[PDB]
Design an enzyme around this catalytic site. Structure first.
Site, PDB file in Angstrom:
ATOM      1  CE1 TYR A  37       0.863   1.520   4.208  1.00 35.48           C
ATOM      2  CE2 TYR A  37       0.766  -0.852   4.510  1.00 35.48           C
ATOM      3  CZ  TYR A  37       1.145   0.397   4.957  1.00 35.48           C
ATOM      4  OH  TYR A  37       1.810   0.522   6.155  1.00 35.48           O
ATOM      5  CE1 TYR A  93      -4.357   9.205   8.155  1.00 37.03           C
ATOM      6  CE2 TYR A  93      -4.853  10.020   5.960  1.00 37.03           C
ATOM      7  CZ  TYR A  93      -3.968   9.456   6.855  1.00 37.03           C
ATOM      8  OH  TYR A  93      -2.692   9.140   6.450  1.00 37.03           O
ATOM      9  CG  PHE A 110      -4.402   5.317   0.196  1.00 39.86           C
ATOM     10  CD1 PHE A 110      -3.325   5.071   1.033  1.00 39.86           C
ATOM     11  CD2 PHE A 110      -5.329   6.277   0.569  1.00 39.86           C
ATOM     12  CE1 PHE A 110      -3.178   5.767   2.218  1.00 39.86           C
ATOM     13  CE2 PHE A 110      -5.187   6.977   1.752  1.00 39.86           C
ATOM     14  CZ  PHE A 110      -4.110   6.722   2.577  1.00 39.86           C
TER      15      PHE A 110
HETATM   16  C1  LIG Z   1       1.764   7.960   8.565  1.00 39.22           C
HETATM   17  C2  LIG Z   1       0.693   7.234   9.093  1.00 39.22           C
HETATM   18  C3  LIG Z   1       0.903   6.405  10.211  1.00 39.22           C
HETATM   19  C4  LIG Z   1      -0.175   5.673  10.744  1.00 39.22           C
HETATM   20  C5  LIG Z   1      -1.456   5.777  10.137  1.00 39.22           C
HETATM   21  S1  LIG Z   1      -2.781   4.714  10.585  1.00 39.22           S
HETATM   22  C6  LIG Z   1      -2.657   3.289   9.422  1.00 39.22           C
HETATM   23  C7  LIG Z   1      -3.952   3.150   8.609  1.00 39.22           C
HETATM   24  O1  LIG Z   1      -4.950   3.759   9.007  1.00 39.22           O
HETATM   25  N1  LIG Z   1      -3.957   2.345   7.514  1.00 39.22           N
HETATM   26  C8  LIG Z   1      -5.237   2.145   6.772  1.00 39.22           C
HETATM   27  C9  LIG Z   1      -5.370   0.707   6.235  1.00 39.22           C
HETATM   28  C10 LIG Z   1      -4.124   0.326   5.441  1.00 39.22           C
HETATM   29  C11 LIG Z   1      -2.870   0.420   6.321  1.00 39.22           C
HETATM   30  C12 LIG Z   1      -2.711   1.848   6.864  1.00 39.22           C
HETATM   31  C13 LIG Z   1      -1.660   6.613   9.014  1.00 39.22           C
HETATM   32  C14 LIG Z   1      -0.582   7.345   8.481  1.00 39.22           C
END
Ligand SMILES: Cc1ccc(SCC(=O)N2CCCCC2)cc1
Length: 117
Positions: A37, A93, A110
């Protein structure tokens, strides 16, 4: 010949784009699948690279450890296939969003790359 290029949206709202056709097998539900990803901002700023771990992200499809765009994205994605999954500021988010990394209202780009299922 050189390749295809088209964009389509779903009823859920999320979007996806074709980057590389995969001639393997569509992701299965209730099973673990390893995929890469890559999070990209509206401008193209990378804020997440699975490659950092130097390994594919192995997660269970349809378990609840991902976002809507993820389950739906992988649900169709095939082994070795690459597609750009576009998730909105609502299916990502959240209403809060990241402090400075990601804005409150904006489209998140993404990239999904299936390596194995
Ligand atoms: C830089 C950063 C660090 C932690 C997070 S939280 C991870 C997340 O929410 N993800 C969604 C599903 C795929 C894997 C990543 C988001 C951004």
């Amino acid at each position: 010949g050189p390749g295809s290029m088209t964009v389509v949206t779903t009823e859920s709202g999320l979007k996806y784009e074709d980057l590389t056709e995969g001639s393997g097998a569509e992701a299965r539900a209730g099973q673990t699948v390893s995929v890469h990803y890559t999070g990209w901002l509206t401008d193209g700023q990378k804020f997440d690279s699975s490659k950092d771990r130097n390994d594919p992200f192995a997660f269970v499809l349809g378990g609840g450890m991902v976002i809507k765009g993820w389950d739906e994205g992988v649900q169709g994605m095939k082994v070795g296939g690459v597609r750009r999954l576009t998730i909105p500021p609502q299916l990502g988010y959240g209403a809060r969003g990241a402090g400075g990394v990601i804005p409150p209202n904006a489209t998140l780009v993404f990239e999904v790359e299936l390596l194995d299922v």
